[PDB]
Structure 1
């Protein structure tokens, strides 16, 4: 059966995170944990935390045998954006967007 874990309102843009999420789509859990460890990106920490949390759920709430779980589905989508102001030359002012994201991972024994 399926098990879910989500990280809502994560402080990172959706486009940057989506690069990391492509590596681990459809792999085994052990390999996915190995790959994220040796990748040098800020997003790799968030995804690894979410994946480990998803692993913990599938064992304590649902059944067991973490040795044959796989990453079935993973996707990223945008969240609310905070707006701030940044001054420019000659009295002009500009808008700034600080984007966030929602992270979901689906792990199952199928």
Structure 2
């Protein structure tokens, strides 16, 4: 039985969050929390928020002990982009996308 947490609308592109998601896939939640605590990645903070949320969900809503929970599934999807204008030289204009992402974490016994 997997317990899920969804961090929707995190202000970071999926390509960057996926590097952190790949680091903790299929690991103990203690090991994953250690890995996320000592990373200098901005995505580590958001993935830690989502993962500790999933652990809290498993304990409160499902009565599962944390000592054997495992990161049984994690993936990062794209979210709604923000479209902005950036002026360029000579009157040209470029379109900037501010990319967001949705993190899904599922912990399992």
Structure 1 length-normalised TM: 0.96
Partner of 1:74: 74
Deviations 1:1-35 (A, max 9, x none): 21000000110000000000111011111111111
Residue aligning to 1:29: 29
Deviation of 1:64 (Å): 2.4
Q: Matched residues in 1 for 2:91 and 2:2: separation?
A: 55
Secondary structure, aligned partner of 2:62:
coil
What is the alpha-carbon distance in structure 1 between the residues aligned to residue 66 and residue 92 of structure 2? 57
Please give the root-mean-square deviation of Cα atoms over the aligned residues, in Å. 0.7
How many angstroms apart in 1 are the aligned matches of 2:92 and 2:22? 40
Q: Distance in 2 between matches of 1:40 and 1:73?
A: 23
Q: 1:28-78: CA deviations, max 9, x gaps?
A: 111111111111110000000110010000011102211110011100110
Q: Which runs of 4+ in 1 moved over 2 A?
A: none
Gaps of at least 5 residues in structure 1 are none
Structure 2: gaps of 5 or more residues: none
Q: 2:100 maps to which residue?
A: 100
CA distance in 1, matches of 2:98, 2:7: 17
Aligned to 1:48: 48
The count of residues paired between Structure 1 and Structure 2 equals: 109
